[PDB]
Structure formats: structure tokens, C-alpha cells
Design a protein around this ligand. Structure first.
Ligand SMILES: CC(C)CCC[C@@H](C)[C@H]1CC[C@H]2[C@@H]3CC=C4C[C@@H](OC(=O)CCC(=O)O)CC[C@]4(C)[C@H]3CC[C@]12C
Ligand SMILES: CC(C)CCC[C@@H](C)[C@H]1CC[C@H]2[C@@H]3CC=C4C[C@@H](OC(=O)CCC(=O)O)CC[C@]4(C)[C@H]3CC[C@]12C
Ligand SMILES: CC(C)CCC[C@@H](C)[C@H]1CC[C@H]2[C@@H]3CC=C4C[C@@H](OC(=O)CCC(=O)O)CC[C@]4(C)[C@H]3CC[C@]12C
Ligand SMILES: CC(C)CCC[C@@H](C)[C@H]1CC[C@H]2[C@@H]3CC=C4C[C@@H](OC(=O)CCC(=O)O)CC[C@]4(C)[C@H]3CC[C@]12C
Ligand SMILES: CC(C)CCC[C@@H](C)[C@H]1CC[C@H]2[C@@H]3CC=C4C[C@@H](OC(=O)CCC(=O)O)CC[C@]4(C)[C@H]3CC[C@]12C
Ligand SMILES: CC(C)CCC[C@@H](C)[C@H]1CC[C@H]2[C@@H]3CC=C4C[C@@H](OC(=O)CCC(=O)O)CC[C@]4(C)[C@H]3CC[C@]12C
Ligand SMILES: *[C@@H]1O[C@H](CO)[C@@H](O)[C@H](O)[C@H]1NC(C)=O
Ligand SMILES: *[C@@H]1O[C@H](CO)[C@@H](O)[C@H](O)[C@H]1NC(C)=O
Lengths: 298, 23, 318, 13, 216, 298, 23, 13
């Protein structure tokens, strides 16, 4: 109890030294371990926000729906349910042997078990299915906004470019999942990071491009609506607001996740960006039905 | 009287007389 | 005959001013809570009676702003009120099939005197008017208009030459004659001592909701639900001036040159009688303006509305 | 600016 | 002398009379704010008297004291062709009770039109409705004989419950803004009809305060 | 990598030795340290769930609520915004020097910042305002559901008992707030949780009692509604389902929060139970309007 | 005119948005 | 069963 009396002292710099595979000493400061713990806590906060927002959008979509068995309704229920399931599996990863400082510092591979590898592969499979559901919803949105045009030259080309981007990022997420599953099946302490960054940049650019297509086509539809009167607030303004939201907000979150400092756990901001890119469609359907019935009421 | 013009006359006369515009 | 029209006779002198007629508000306050069903001036200009869907009949003071007497009612659902010219008798009826003569005395709100109650009608009683200190004329939803007495407490004569509900009644301040309206539109004048009808006028297939005699006593005006006002003469059986939301209430000034009128959604309006043109709409009231009646002396005007307010105007001869 | 990364046993967020 | 006259001399009697007038006015307004009024319009000779009698001239203020609540029922009567003039007075009321004599076919038709105009009048737009079919036993008796071709545009002879359900559907198919409307088949021996009016008034106030706080 | 070659060895029982104020040795196992980190991460998960659920309820309530400026709308918006602001200050607490393993293992008051003391006081103030908004909402709920009945003796008694429980809970939460704030401003290593447990049981019993009252009164209104016809699924059944939910589910979560094993960070399950007691009313308004316009327009 | 062609395009996109359930 | 516990500087849940 020598250092209690000292009024000026920094216990964040003091040395934790533990048994490890590099050596029996293995000294590290309290501030680096607290940075690790803050990274895990920030990941837990973002995945908690994801799970809670998806759970309540699932409840409100079950309650505030005029139409069920509708295809976009089913795609959105699959998307929100896969967000809930992926966040549940990520909560089960964060409170597990891999995330723990018993393996994040002391790299003893006996702590890891085959169940954690199975859960890892399951979480990657659920993320692949979630990206498939997101791209399915976006290609359905483009393929339903580009029907009806009488000059199908830029429309079919834009829809094929969107389908190519969607199947490209689903394939990139799929090959990233298979490559991570085989490299974890071989060695439990190995990682692949190139395919993840490729698939994440492909997903961000996919959401950006399809939101650009949606914003420009909704601007042209609103201009064609101004030719028919109709300067009232309508469903198309809600679609433009939520499309510009999915154009601006998760792009800014992706740029922020690539922009901020590393090793603080803020790299999972891509999840919150993916989450808002999902929630662009159910909240617009809720706002559209609410504005329809409230305008018929008013 | 049978003529309506005397009726109109007594209306306009009874409203014309004993008037002022002091405002 | 029909070729004589008041506007054509009045072409020699048109209006002098058509804007900014002086009207000074005196009171915007009440103790009422429900819509003013009726209000009526005493024969002297001192006091005004009023009632609402609440139980009270209030005597208001014209010069000051506060209340002299507030008489409760046996029937809460009153549609009409009256003050005797002797100003010791007060009358009420409507939605109860009974006309009630109270006596106001000793400057109190007790309503100690229910002098007489008359059960002769099997329908609502729309208009009440006083002839003298003893008689009381009322008109019903059934065709009868009965003149009860305070000593005798019985009917004298029943004029029933009308079909449909009689909505209002008119007595000139001066012979002793009355007039009534109806739903199947008629504006008969009666000498009121014989059951037959003295006169009749054009039907126009509308209901007539407001009747006033001219201040000289030789003319009659009748407002309707379609927004039309008739300006018939007491004699010769000729229509003179049509003035064409409906007219709920009318009155003339002491001069007789401007007519205060109440429309269903326009509001209170003033009409130039000679020109036949709108001069000085009164948008002061917050709610639907039930009625307007001017004073016998003419110095003041009284207006009442659905917002449970009284507005006393007091112009400098307007 | 930095490239995003995983950990050895971290799944794919 | 018709001026405002604020500084008049006998103001002591005026301020000793106006304040007792004002306390009387506020006393009776506070008395008549709490009460719950029921219109009971129906039509003439429809049997309003029977249902009010088992619940227990002109307008009859049939006031009750159930508990701390103080009811009031206005037995309207002497129906007239121009009720629209004086019907403005009953904006304040919580509900209209309506009584339909089931057996009378022409009175059924005229009462259907009267029910429509009182259901979609401006004054009762807030106020919910309660309906009473007065002649369930007479309609059960006389539904076997003489079906009327003004009723049943399309509807077999059957029992009386078929046809009665057509009537209880066309009454409910007449409210534009979906005000609360309750329906009852009452007879001359209907023991359970005061329960109906009390349950309807409590349901009315619950659905008029759960859309004033905002929960619905 | 001597024990990295070793196939069987348990690093969870391996011993960290670090310096502390209580003694130079202060040996600990990795199981205790990962217990600390897992409790902090579990708190972060539940508070992320709370923050995301409340934030998306605030967004959907801003989108799908017909009548704003009604009192229950303002109370719901205030309570959801206080859940968001409380969760935000709790995120600021979990990533800071009070919750860190620097202070939770080495009792050094030099690391404790007075800005963190201001954060602590602000968090207790926001918690007291949160319980005040919750009891305001439930007292308003009883005071509206007991109107209309003609025997105002059992209704006035139950309304007064509800107001008594609400005032007692708010006063006990404020007593806990000032009783913790003056001691934390005095001594940074002291606390007072018995008043906190009393106020938590008062909050749980207030939610349970007012939900019992609403369930019984809505079942009696349903049985008295069946007497007048009206056997369809309507807004009263929606209110009965949401009040039975706010009777059963948060009381079970309170029982679980008092039942589960300690030092696991599951004690903040009371914030999920109070979250669902908050969310019973906006979801009931959403369901009620989205089935009332359905039944009355479609 | 292009009134009618733009209105037909608007009706088809609104009807397919309503069928697919965004509106 | 366990009474709810607040850590020495933890705020109110
Ligand atoms: C109405 C439904 C469709 C949505 C709302 C409910 C879900 C958001 C909740 C309900 C039950 C929850 C689960 C209950 C228990 C667990 C186990 C839990 O496991 C651990 O923490 C393991 C730690 C260890 O083993 O050390 C991880 C979260 C999870 C899956 C929870 C994730 C979130 C779930 C699915
Ligand atoms: C319209 C609805 C449906 C969505 C609105 C969401 C936004 C209001 C949120 C979502 C993403 C959020 C951002 C996500 C991450 C960050 C980084 C965060 O941290 C830093 O910038 C670190 C600074 C430092 O190093 O001290 C500050 C808040 C910010 C910009 C957030 C601000 C609020 C944002 C824009
Ligand atoms: C719209 C909302 C209300 C949906 C409902 C979500 C919650 C009810 C879920 C989401 C996350 C869940 C938590 C996620 C993980 C855990 C850890 C779990 O503890 C362990 O397994 C850890 C054991 C160990 O320490 O080794 C206990 C349940 C709990 C608190 C779960 C409880 C239920 C929670 C709060
Ligand atoms: C789904 C919608 C309705 C809500 C979206 C909420 C998120 C956009 C918020 C909630 C939690 C926030 C995070 C909470 C804590 C942190 C850690 C903070 O980094 C630190 O630890 C402080 C800086 C340092 O230590 O140097 C940077 C911002 C960040 C990632 C925040 C970014 C914005 C987040 C993800
Ligand atoms: C009305 C709805 C749409 C609002 C949704 C946005 C919030 C959920 C976000 C926006 C900004 C976020 C905050 C941005 C930054 C921070 C600071 C962060 O703490 C730190 O960065 C470390 C502080 C320290 O060093 O102690 C904790 C989370 C918090 C409060 C975030 C909590 C979540 C907030 C309020
Ligand atoms: C609005 C409605 C749909 C909310 C429903 C919420 C439930 C689905 C959640 C709320 C709290 C949850 C519980 C919170 C904590 C736990 C403990 C958790 O971990 C243990 O039992 C510990 C194991 C061990 O001892 O190691 C298992 C799930 C369980 C029962 C959860 C099961 C799912 C529950 C009941
Ligand atoms: C104590 O610390 C040393 C590092 O100096 C470490 O090697 C040792 O394993 C620790 N434990 C014991 C029991 O000595
Ligand atoms: C940690 O390392 C330092 C380096 O010399 C050593 O002095 C200290 O004893 C070690 N810690 C423990 C607990 O042995």
C-alpha cells in the first residue's frame, strides 16, 4: 500500500505481466487492456442498438401493416429477423472464448473449442444471407420503380448494373465466408482481411449507387407529378426522404468507420450503416401508410 | 292608401326628419 | 302599385358615407355560460333581459355593465323571453308547452314569484311579446297564438290562419296589432281583436325566421333562411323591397335608415335601407351571432351571440 | 484512414 | 347618461347585488356541469315510455342518482317538422337514445331517414348513439306474415332473426365518421335494459377520454 | 511458445499478478477479470438494446402518430428521450474511468475525474426524471381508465393508491439520487444501494399494480362491451393485450433480475423491464390506430 | 400529349409500388 | 436471490 498516499500518480501506465505464449513476462499497460475492453464494449453497444432497433421494427411491422404476404413485407421480415439473429450470434461471440482476454492476450488455443468455430461459421452464413436479403430488397426496389417506363434503354441497363452489383457483393460475401471458414478450420488463430474489405466496399457502393438511382428516379417521378398538380405531401416525398437518408447517412457512417482511428472498436459502425440501409424501407412504408390515412382523415 | 308610392314616401320622410350626423 | 320601389323613390338622395360608421363597444363581459337564446329591451331604455340554456333569466343594465336581477327558471330549455312595459312582469316559454310569468321584485335572484303558468299548447312556444301590463301574447309550434291574462289566466282569442310552425312575432311600439311568420311562409298581419287575418303576403316557399315592424309602425320586414329580407307595407298588399346562410334576427335604428341584421355565417351586418347596400359589417363577436336588437330610445344597440357574450354598442347617432 | 479488419476468430460484421 | 358611468353614486347596492347574482350563476353552472344528459328522441308513439319506465309534460327532466354520478334523461316528445331549429341546444349531451317500433313498416322507413339525418347532423357529430328496437316480440310474431317489398332488396322468409340482422346492419351502415353506436332489442318484459344504458354510458365516457388523453 | 505446443492447459486458471492499493501481490485469476469484462459488456449490450429500441420508437412515433401535443404523446416522448439520454450518459460511464479495470482492480481515486462526478450526478437526475415520467404515464392511465363508472368509491380508492405508489417511488428515487450524490462528492469509493433496491421494488410493484388495475378494468369493459354487441377484435382488446403484456413480461423480467446469479451484469435487466413498461403505451397507440383505420376504412 | 404518357407511367409505378407494398 | 448492487461509482440503472 505504498502508492495510495501519492496525490499525483498514473495507474493507467502500470504493468500487468502475465504468462503467455511469447514468454512468461509479457508486460502490458493498463491503458492498452482498457482500450481492448473499450473496443469490445463499443462493439457490444453497436450490436445492442442493431438488435433493439430490428426487434422493434419487427414488432411494429407485425402490428402496423395493412398488407401481409406481400413480397417486400416478407423480404423485410427476413432482413430484420436476420439482423436479430446475427446480432444474437454476435452477442454470443462477444461473451465467449474468442473475444475474452484469456485468448486476446494469452494466445493458448486450448481455450477455443469446436463449438465456437461452428458458431463463427453460423454467424458468417447468417451475414451472407443478410447481405443476400439486403441486395434482394434493393434490386426489388429498382425493378419495381423502373417498370412502367416507355423508353426502356437506360432503365434496363441500370437494372442490370444494379443486379450485377448485387450478385457481385453477395458473391464476395460468400467467398469471404468460405475463405474465413476454411482458414479457421485449419488454424484457430488465423484471419483473412482482404475479402472482408472488398465485400464491405462493394456493399457500401451498392447501397450508394442504388440509392442514387432511387433518388433521381423519385425526383423525375415527383416532377412528372407536378405536371399533374399534386404539390401536397405524398408517399413519393417520403420515398425521396428515406432514399436520400439511405444515400447520405450510411455513406457517412461507412466513411466514418474507414476514417476514424483504429483499435477502438468503432470499425463495426458498418453494422449501424447496414442497419439504417435496411430500415430505410420499413419506416418509409410505415410513414407512407400513416401519411395516407392521416391525409384522408385531415 | 292603395298606391305604394305614398308608403315609400312616409318611410323616407320618417327616416329623413329628426336626423343628425354629429359622428 | 308594384312599380313603386323604395330604392327607386330614394334615388334622389343616395348615401352620404359608406364606411367607418362610429360604433363604440361598452361591454364584452357576461356571467352566462350557454348561448343567448333571446334578449329583449325594456320599453324604457334602462334594462335588457336575456336568457341562455342555463337556468337563469338575467336583467342587465344598459348604462352600466353589471347585472341588476338574475331570475332562475322552472324550465331550463327556454327559447324566448319578455318584459312587460310596466317592467314588473317577466315572461318565458319554449320546449315545455308552458308560458311562465314571473315577477321581479325586492332586487333579488330568488325567483320568489311564479305568478301564472299556462298549459294550452301541445308544442313548443317560439315567440313571446307583451301588449300591456295585463295581456301576454305568445305563439306556438301549433298554429295558435294565445293572449293570456295575469288576472284571468285564460285565453281570449286564437288566430290560427297559418299552417306550419310560427317562429316569431312583431308588435309596433305604438293600433294594437301583431304579426307572425311561419315555415310554410306567410307574414299575415292581424288587428289582434278578431280571429280572422287582416292581411297576407308572398310565400316564396321558404321559412321566415325574423320579423320587425318599422319604427313609424307602417311597414314590416321579414328575414328568411335563404338570405332574403322582405320590406312589405302594412297597407295595400304590395311587395316593396327584397334585400337578397339566412337571417336570424333584424332591427332598425331610431332613425330608421340603417337596419342591423344577423346572418347565419356572414355575421352581424348593417344595411342602408334607402340605398339597399351593405355598410359596416360587425366582425367583433367570436362566435355565431344569435341576435341584434336596438334600444327604443336609440342611443344604444345590443348584440348577443353563441359565445355567451353581450356587446352593447353606443354610437353618437351612428 | 485505415483498412477495416477482423480478429482471428471474429465473424464478419 | 347612457355612457359607461364607472363613477356612479349608488354602487354599494350594485356591488352587493351583482356578486350574489354571480355566485348563484357559478353555483348552478358548477351544479349542471357534472350531470350526464341523455336525449331519448325516438319518434312519437314509439314506446319510449315503456323502456324509461322499466329503467326507473313536454320535455321531462327524468333525473336519476345512480352513485356519485347524477344522471339526467330528457324525455322529448311532441315531434314537429322543424326540430332542427331548437335541436342546437343539445350540443352538450353525452348521448342520444333512440327508440324504434319494429312492427311499423312506414314508421321504420321514416325513422330510418330521421336516424340518418340525426346521425349526420353537425351538432351530434361528437355524440354517440344508442338504439332500441321496441317491438322484438311483435316483429317475431308478424315477420311470418306479409313481407314488405320496400325492405329486402335482395333475403328469404326464414326466421325473424334473418331480416332482423338486415335491419341491425343497415342501422349500423349509416354513420359516416364511425361514432359509437350501440343496438338493443327491447321488449315489454325486457328486464335487462337499464344495464344496457348504464353500460353504454360508461363505454361512451371511456372512449371519449381514451381519445382525449391520446391512448387511442 | 512452450505451452503453445502443449495441447491441454487451462489459461482461465492462470494467475495475473498486478499492483494495487491493497497490496503489492494482489493475485487474480483470468476468470475474475473476464467476469468483470463480461459484466461490463452485458451492461453495454442491454443498454444498447434499450437505446436502440427507444430511439426507433421515438422515430416511428414521430412518423406514425396522428395527434401530437396530446398529453400522453408528450409523456411518451419525454420518457423515451430520457431513456435515450440516460443510455447515452451510461455509454459515457461504461467507457470511462469509473467502470474501467484500472479502477475496478486498483482502487486509485486519482483516476476518478470530477467531470465523471458531474456525469454521475447528471445520470441520477435523468434517472429520477425518467421514473417521474413513467409514474406520470401510469397514473394518467389509471385516472383515465377509471372515468365513466358511476360508483366512484372503489375507483377513487384505486386511483389514490396508484398515486400514492407513484409519489412514493419518485420520492424514493430522489432520496437515492441525493443520498448517492452527496456521498460520491464526499468519498469516491462509497455507495448506497438499499435505498436503490427499495426504489426498484417500488417501481416494479407500481408497474405490476397499475397493470393489474388496467387488466381487470379492461376485462370488465370487454365483458360489459360484449353485452352491447361489439364482439370484434378492436382497440379495447389491443389495450388488454398490451396491458397484460406490461403485467406479465416486465414483472417476469424484474423477477429474473432479482433471481439470476450476481456479478454477471444481469442486474440491469430492470432497465429492459422498465423499457417494456414504457413501450407498452406507444405500441398500443400504434396498433390501435393501425387497426382502427384498417377496420374503419378497409 | 406527354401529359397522358407521363400520367400512365406515374399510374403504373404507383400501382406497382402499392402492389409490392411500399405504399 | 440477491438484492441489486450498485458499484461504488456506478449510477442508478
Ligand atoms: C420478438 C422477437 C422476434 C424479437 C425480440 C426478442 C429477441 C431480441 C431476444 C429474445 C431472446 C433473446 C436471446 C436470449 C438469450 C441469449 C443467449 C446469450 O448467450 C450468452 O450471452 C452466452 C454467454 C456465454 O456462454 O458465456 C446471447 C444472446 C441471446 C441469444 C438473446 C438474443 C436476443 C433474443 C433473441
Ligand atoms: C433520420 C434517422 C432515421 C437517422 C439519423 C441518424 C443520425 C442522427 C446518426 C446516425 C449515425 C450517427 C453518427 C455515427 C458516428 C459518429 C462518430 C462519433 O465519434 C466521433 O466522431 C469521434 C470523435 C473523437 O475522436 O473524439 C460522433 C457522432 C457521430 C458523427 C454520429 C452522429 C449522429 C449520426 C449521424
Ligand atoms: C425490443 C426489445 C425489448 C427486445 C428484447 C431484447 C432483450 C430482452 C434481450 C436482448 C439482449 C439480451 C441479453 C443478451 C445476453 C445476455 C447474457 C446472458 O448471460 C450469459 O450467458 C453470460 C454468462 C457468463 O458470464 O459466462 C444472460 C442473458 C442476457 C443478459 C440477455 C437478456 C435478454 C436481452 C436483454
Ligand atoms: C439506430 C439509430 C436510431 C441510433 C443510432 C445510434 C448510433 C449511431 C450511436 C449509438 C452508440 C454510439 C457510439 C457510442 C460510443 C462510441 C465510442 C467513441 O469512442 C470513444 O471511446 C471515445 C474516443 C476515444 O476514446 O478516443 C466514438 C463514438 C462511438 C463509436 C459512438 C458512435 C455512434 C453510436 C454507434
Ligand atoms: C432522436 C434520435 C433520432 C436520436 C438518435 C441519435 C443518438 C442515439 C446518438 C446520436 C449521438 C450519440 C452520442 C455521440 C457521442 C457519445 C459519447 C460517447 O462517449 C465517448 O465518446 C467517451 C467519453 C469519455 O471519454 O468518457 C458515449 C456515447 C454518446 C453519448 C452517443 C450516444 C448516442 C447518441 C446520443
Ligand atoms: C415484448 C416481448 C416479446 C418481450 C419478451 C422478452 C423475453 C423473450 C426475454 C426477456 C428476458 C429474457 C431472459 C433473460 C435472461 C435469461 C438468462 C439466460 O442465461 C441463463 O439462464 C444463465 C445460464 C448459466 O447459468 O450459465 C438464458 C435466457 C434468459 C432466461 C432470457 C430468456 C428470454 C427472456 C425471457
Ligand atoms: C507473477 O509475475 C511473474 C512475472 O514477473 C509471472 O511470470 C508469474 O507467473 C506470476 N505468478 C506467480 C505465481 O509467480
Ligand atoms: C512486472 O515486471 C516488472 C519488471 O521488472 C517486475 O519488476 C515486476 O515484479 C513484475 N510484476 C510482478 C507482479 O511480478
Amino acid at each position: 500500500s505504498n502508492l495510495f498516499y501519492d496525490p499525483t500518480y498514473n495507474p493507467g501506465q502500470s504493468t500487468i505481466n502475465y504468462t503467455s505464449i511469447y514468454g512468461n513476462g509479457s508486460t502490458i499497460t493498463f491503458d492498452e487492456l482498457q482500450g481492448l475492453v473499450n473496443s469490445t464494449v463499443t462493439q457490444a453497444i453497436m450490436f445492442g442498438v442493431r438488435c433493439g432497433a430490428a426487434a422493434l421494427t419487427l414488432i411494429v411491422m407485425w402490428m402496423t401493416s395493412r398488407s401481409r404476404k406481400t413480397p417486400i413485407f416478407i423480404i423485410n421480415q427476413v432482413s430484420l429477423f436476420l439482423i436479430i439473429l446475427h446480432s444474437a450470434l454476435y452477442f454470443k461471440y462477444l461473451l465467449s472464448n474468442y473475444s475474452s482476454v484469456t485468448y486476446a492476450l494469452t494466445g493458448f488455443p486450448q481455450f477455443i473449442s469446436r463449438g465456437d468455430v461452428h458458431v463463427y461459421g453460423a454467424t458468417n452464413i447468417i451475414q451472407v444471407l443478410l447481405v443476400a436479403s439486403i441486395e434482394t430488397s434493393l434490386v426489388f426496389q429498382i425493378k419495381v420503380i423502373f417498370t412502367g417506363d416507355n423508353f426502356k434503354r437506360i432503365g434496363l441497363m441500370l437494372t442490370s448494373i444494379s443486379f450485377t452489383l448485387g450478385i457481385a457483393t453477395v458473391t464476395m460475401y460468400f467467398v469471404s465466408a468460405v475463405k474465413g471458414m476454411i482458414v479457421t478450420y485449419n488454424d484457430v488463430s488465423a484471419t483473412q482481411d482482404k475479402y472482408f474489405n472488398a465485400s464491405t466496399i462493394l456493399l457500401a457502393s451498392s447501397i450508394n449507387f442504388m440509392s442514387f438511382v432511387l433518388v433521381v428516379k423519385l425526383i423525375l417521378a415527383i416532377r412528372s407529378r407536378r405536371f399533374l398538380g399534386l404539390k401536397q405531401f405524398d408517399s413519393f416525398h417520403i420515398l425521396l426522404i428515406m432514399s436520400c437518408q439511405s444515400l447520405l447517412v450510411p455513406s457517412i457512417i461507412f466513411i466514418l468507420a474507414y476514417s476514424l482511428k483504429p483499435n477502438q472498436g468503432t470499425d463495426v459502425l458498418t453494422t449501424v450503416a447496414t442497419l439504417l440501409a435496411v430500415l430505410s424501407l420499413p419506416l418509409s412504408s410505415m410513414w407512407a401508410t400513416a401519411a395516407n390515412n392521416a391525409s384522408k382523415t385531415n | 292608401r292603395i298606391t305604394a308610392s305614398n308608403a315609400c314616401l312616409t318611410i323616407i320622410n320618417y327616416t329623413s326628419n329628426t336626423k343628425d350626423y354629429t359622428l | 302599385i308594384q312599380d313603386a320601389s323604395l330604392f327607386q323613390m330614394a334615388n334622389k338622395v343616395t348615401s352620404l358615407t359608406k364606411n367607418k360608421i362610429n360604433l363604440k363597444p361598452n361591454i364584452v363581459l357576461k356571467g352566462h355560460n350557454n348561448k343567448i337564446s333571446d334578449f329583449r329591451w325594456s320599453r324604457d331604455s334602462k334594462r335588457i333581459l336575456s336568457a341562455s340554456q342555463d337556468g337563469f333569466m338575467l336583467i342587465w343594465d344598459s348604462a352600466s355593465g353589471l347585472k341588476q336581477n338574475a331570475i332562475p327558471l322552472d324550465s331550463q330549455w327556454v327559447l324566448s323571453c319578455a318584459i312587460s312595459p310596466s317592467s314588473t312582469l317577466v315572461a318565458s316559454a319554449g320546449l315545455n308547452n308552458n308560458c311562465t310569468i314571473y315577477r321581479v321584485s325586492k332586487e333579488n335572484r330568488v325567483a320568489q314569484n311564479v305568478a301564472s303558468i299556462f298549459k294550452g299548447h301541445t308544442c313548443y312556444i317560439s315567440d313571446i311579446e307583451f301588449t300591456d301590463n295585463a295581456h301576454i301574447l305568445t305563439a306556438s309550434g301549433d298554429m295558435t297564438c294565445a293572449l293570456w291574462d295575469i288576472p284571468k289566466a285564460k285565453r281570449v282569442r286564437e288566430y290560427s290562419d297559418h299552417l306550419g310552425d310560427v317562429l316569431a312575432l312583431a308588435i309596433p311600439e305604438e293600433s294594437n296589432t301583431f304579426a307572425s311568420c311561419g315555415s310554410d311562409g306567410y307574414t299575415y298581419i292581424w288587428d289582434s281583436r278578431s280571429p280572422s287575418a287582416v292581411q297576407s303576403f308572398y310565400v316564396n316557399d321558404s321559412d321566415i325566421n325574423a320579423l320587425r315592424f318599422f319604427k313609424d309602425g307602417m311597414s314590416i320586414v321579414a328575414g328568411s333562411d335563404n338570405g332574403a329580407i322582405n320590406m312589405y307595407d302594412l297597407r295595400s298588399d304590395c311587395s316593396i323591397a327584397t334585400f337578397s346562410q339566412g337571417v336570424v334576427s333584424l332591427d332598425f335604428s331610431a332613425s330608421g335608415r340603417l337596419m342591423y341584421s344577423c346572418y347565419t355565417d356572414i355575421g352581424c351586418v348593417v344595411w342602408d335601407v334607402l340605398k339597399g347596400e351593405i355598410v359596416g359589417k360587425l366582425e367583433g363577436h367570436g362566435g355565431r351571432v344569435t341576435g341584434v336588437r336596438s334600444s327604443p330610445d336609440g342611443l344604444a344597440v345590443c348584440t348577443g351571440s353563441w359565445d355567451s357574450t353581450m356587446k352593447i354598442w353606443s354610437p353618437g347617432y351612428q | 484512414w485505415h483498412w477495416l479488419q477482423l480478429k482471428p476468430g471474429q465473424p464478419m460484421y | 347618461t347612457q355612457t359607461i358611468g364607472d363613477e356612479s353614486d349608488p354602487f354599494l347596492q350594485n356591488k352587493r347585488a351583482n356578486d350574489v347574482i354571480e355566485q348563484s350563476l357559478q353555483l348552478e353552472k358548477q351544479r349542471d356541469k357534472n350531470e350526464i344528459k341523455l336525449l331519448l328522441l325516438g319518434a312519437d308513439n314509439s314506446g319510449k315510455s315503456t323502456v324509461l319506465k322499466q329503467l326507473k309534460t313536454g320535455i321531462t327532466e327524468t333525473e336519476f342518482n345512480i352513485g356519485s354520478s347524477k344522471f339526467k334523461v330528457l324525455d322529448a316528445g311532441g315531434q314537429r317538422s322543424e326540430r332542427k331549429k331548437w335541436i342546437h341546444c343539445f350540443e352538450g349531451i353525452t348521448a342520444v337514445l333512440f327508440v324504434l317500433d319494429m312492427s311499423d313498416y312506414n314508421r321504420m322507413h321514416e325513422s330510418i331517414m330521421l336516424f340518418d339525418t340525426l346521425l349526420n347532423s353537425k351538432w351530434f357529430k361528437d355524440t354517440p348513439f344508442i338504439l332500441f328496437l321496441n317491438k322484438i316480440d311483435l316483429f317475431e310474431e308478424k315477420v311470418k306474415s306479409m313481407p314488405i317489398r320496400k325492405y329486402f332488396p335482395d333475403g328469404r322468409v326464414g326466421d325473424a332473426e334473418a331480416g332482423l340482422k338486415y335491419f341491425e346492419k343497415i342501422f349500423l351502415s349509416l354513420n359516416k365518421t364511425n361514432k359509437p353506436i350501440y343496438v338493443k332489442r327491447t321488449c315489454a318484459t325486457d328486464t335487462q335494459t337499464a344495464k344496457f344504458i348504464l353500460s353504454a354510458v360508461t363505454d361512451l365516457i371511456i372512449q371519449q377520454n381514451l381519445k382525449k388523453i391520446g391512448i387511442i
